[PDB]
């Protein structure tokens, strides 16, 4: 009888995993503080990694990788890419980004300003965006408004180049982002969930007005609140891979695999492979796995850009059942076996 605990009472994903475990009759759930567990579904913040793997006779597995926040924090990702050689500062698939601390508190203000001045000095597009992990986003083309917006906040803010030429879905002349659910098992095998979702914008894109952020931010919550065309084109502003792969063919004479998925798969490998020697639990006294939520941007040239990596992502309503079961099959049963894979293994060198 395998045992597990539930310490994050908000994870919609692992609330389904928990239910699936009990459905096997071979998993017993304990109290959130019982130390005799095989698998821990830990809390988001301040997860007590230092107490894992110290129970005699118990193999213990946790649904998080200690140190993966370096990839899932706004400022942390930019610093990780700029400092990491595997990614380098000339990283082609990450928008130009600078870490800006509020003045009431290293800082890249001057570096960003020189980059800004060089653009305006050359007539180039100069639309930037300011955002932070505690969000509160601002789209502006004036280096002043963006910097002053950050000084009005008390946490670390990031400013990156705003993609002014995004791929627009027709009809609608609208924007969108791609969400790819990734899973890294205890062996560090990088599995990409075959199914993704495009969180679409129900408002036409207007490059001459960045103040109305409803046609520029493709967040599912922004569209369902301030956008008045929600669910018009697709249900819940969610376009799934089968339909979007069909639009890319009829509209652009290409496929989701060639035009986008190849880069999405390459960007996932490059990031996870970069932080392997720091978060891997190969010879560790406990095992880690984790489900990541990658967010991509696609410009009009069919170039994929990484926006951010989410370490605690939800899931599309239509995809919970399929994805949660795969987590149990690749991430859990692989360690605690019972009595066509929905993923795509991204081969790499450990």
């Amino acid at each position: 009888m395998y045992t597990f605990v539930v310490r994050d009472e908000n994870s919609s994903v692992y609330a389904e995993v928990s239910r699936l475990l009990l459905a096997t009759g071979q998993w017993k759930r304990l109290r959130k503080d019982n130390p005799r567990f095989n698998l821990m579904l830990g809390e988001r913040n301040r997860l007590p990694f230092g107490r894992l793997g110290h129970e005699p006779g118990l193999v213990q597995l946790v649904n998080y990788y200690r140190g993966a926040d370096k990839l899932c924090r706004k400022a942390s990702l930019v610093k990780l890419i700029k400092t990491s050689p595997e990614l380098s500062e000339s990283c082609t698939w990450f928008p130009e980004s600078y870490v800006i601390y509020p003045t009431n508190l290293t800082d890249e203000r001057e570096v960003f300003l020189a980059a800004y001045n060089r653009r305006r000095e050359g007539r180039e597009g100069n639309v930037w965006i300011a955002k932070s992990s505690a969000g509160g986003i601002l789209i502006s083309s004036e280096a002043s408004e963006l910097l002053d917006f950050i000084d009005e906040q008390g946490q670390v803010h990031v400013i990156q180049k705003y993609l002014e030429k995004p791929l627009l879905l027709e009809p609608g002349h609208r924007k969108f982002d791609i969400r790819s659910w990734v899973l890294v098992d205890h062996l560090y095998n990088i599995y990409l969930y075959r199914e993704g979702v495009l969180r679409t914008s129900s408002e036409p894109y207007n490059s001459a007005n960045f103040q109305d952020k409803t046609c520029h931010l493709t967040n599912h919550c922004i569209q369902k609140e301030y956008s008045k065309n929600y669910g018009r084109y697709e249900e819940g502003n969610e376009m799934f891979f089968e339909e979007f792969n069909q639009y890319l063919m009829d509209a652009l004479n290409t496929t989701l695999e060639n035009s986008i998925l190849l880069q999405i798969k390459h960007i996932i490998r490059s990031c996870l492979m970069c932080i392997e020697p720091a978060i891997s639990t190969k010879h560790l006294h406990y095992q880690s796995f984790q489900l990541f939520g990658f967010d991509f941007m696609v410009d009009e040239e069919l170039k994929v850009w990484l926006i951010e990596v989410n370490g605690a992502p939800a899931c599309a309503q239509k995809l919970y059942a399929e994805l949660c079961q795969g987590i149990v099959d690749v991430a859990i049963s692989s360690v605690f076996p019972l009595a066509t894979s929905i993923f795509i293994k991204l081969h790499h060198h450990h």
Binding site: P48, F49, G50, R51, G53, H54, P56, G57, R66, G67, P277, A278, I279, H283, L284, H285
Partner: protein, 438 residues
Amino acid sequence: MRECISIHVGQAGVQIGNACWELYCLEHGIQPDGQMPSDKTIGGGDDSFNTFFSETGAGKHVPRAVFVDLEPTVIDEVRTGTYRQLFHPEQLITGKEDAANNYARGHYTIGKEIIDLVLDRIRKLADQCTGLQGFLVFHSFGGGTGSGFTSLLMERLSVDYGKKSKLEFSIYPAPQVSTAVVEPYNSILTTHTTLEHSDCAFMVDNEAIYDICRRNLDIERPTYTNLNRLISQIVSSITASLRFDGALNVDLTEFQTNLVPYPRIHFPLATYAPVISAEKAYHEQLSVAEITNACFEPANQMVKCDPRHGKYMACCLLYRGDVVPKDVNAAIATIKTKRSIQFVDWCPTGFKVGINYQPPTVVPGGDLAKVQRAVCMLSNTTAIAEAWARLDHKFDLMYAKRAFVHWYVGEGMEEGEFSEAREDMAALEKDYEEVGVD
């Protein structure tokens, strides 16, 4: 030459001390009857090994050690074991009833009755020391004597030997090789009262020593013999600088200078390699680069933690055998570009390297294979604070219900001393958090 006095308290301390002095005699060529054919200074001399061994006119080489326990069973083994001819009966001190895994019993009730006899026996060893460096205190955390009597002895040694260093070799409680439930209390109680009296403490988690025995030595269910035969290898690596010629860690003070920049954070993490099963007829000999890189695999740490999520304040590489500086520096570079070695800002990023040419000595008919080169890495990492977290947590689970508290209050200790010690451990964790986290 300055001397070192070894003090072994309780069953854990005493049995570990038995394995260490065995290895010391083998390493220095000292026969079980205390003779040393190579020593040409008969009854005297100020050589490196004389820091751990005095000499009688009869040429016998007597360890500078005291064994103390509250029950006689474990010390009686030494009185008749193989090396019974090394120790004088005065160096072996025993009571009649132990501390029953009760710190209060070992510190107050029974301890107060034997403390002055131990100090007198220690003073007698000091009287033979022209320049005493200090003491090495071997003991367990979870025992009633190793925890309760050690801290009392440590309090007293500070008063009588103020200017003397005191290093600890502590056994951290692992539930798989122990049959107690009050060990969280005893550990925090003794760590609380011993912190300001120990200049440097090398903890060894039985859980880590145990897994090494199962994994590398292929021992299904290891015994204390297997555990201590390995612990002695590590202890030998750490004290070899004091018993042989050299320039690194030449006296007990240099241990603090090179490993402990902050007085409270004096718990260096030990990492040893290689550990090869002797049953293996032929095992390939690892290179400086291969053993050096093993000092960063968790499975070779005396305490299981993750240095990738801590900050180093110091790091020592103690090599034994066929190791040349050229190959060490080379491997040190290869490990910076591939390893997460994040020092603290107010400290240089470097390594103090010591090389002794004599390879690790193996005990005849033991568990360890004969290797051509070994290394012990002492590093002061904030990841060892994981060990305090585990311990403090267990302490908190019992102390919330006051479970077992009556056994301690009943032996004179006050209940306030519990939370007083716990508040200190909390401050100790808080100090580790400041130095290694941003």
